């Protein structure tokens, strides 16, 4: 039962992610393997006038986090940022 989520595109560049999400509404997002740091992952998210990018942080027990709160999986991280703003500078909430 392994298929990736419809918004997880492993190979998509930063620039391709910005072009895509400019054609979607605020909060729409994708996850990609990081281009500037091999082995990282990135969430690109449509904000009001532009697309901003967040680095997926990990610890040794394998949690995922972006800011403070920690999650056992990428999907649980996603789901939590559906109702807590992923941006600390404006109000922005993951939506699909």
């Amino acid at each position: 039962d392994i298929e990736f989520p419809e918004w997880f595109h492993e190979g998509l560049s930063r620039h391709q992610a910005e072009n895509l999400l400019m054609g979607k509404d605020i909060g729409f997002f994708i996850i990609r393997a990081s281009q500037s740091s091999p082995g990282d992952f990135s969430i690109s998210v449509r904000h009001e006038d532009d697309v901003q990018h967040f680095k997926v942080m990990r610890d040794t027990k394998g949690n995922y986090f972006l800011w403070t709160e920690k999650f056992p999986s990428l999907n649980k991280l996603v789901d939590y940022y559906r109702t807590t703003s992923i941006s600390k500078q404006k109000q922005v909430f993951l939506r699909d």
């Binding site: 990135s42 990018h53 967040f54 680095k55 942080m57 941006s87």
Partner: peptide
């Protein structure tokens, strides 16, 4: 390139 949480 910048990231908003770093």
């Amino acid at each position: 390139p910048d990231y908003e949480n770093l």
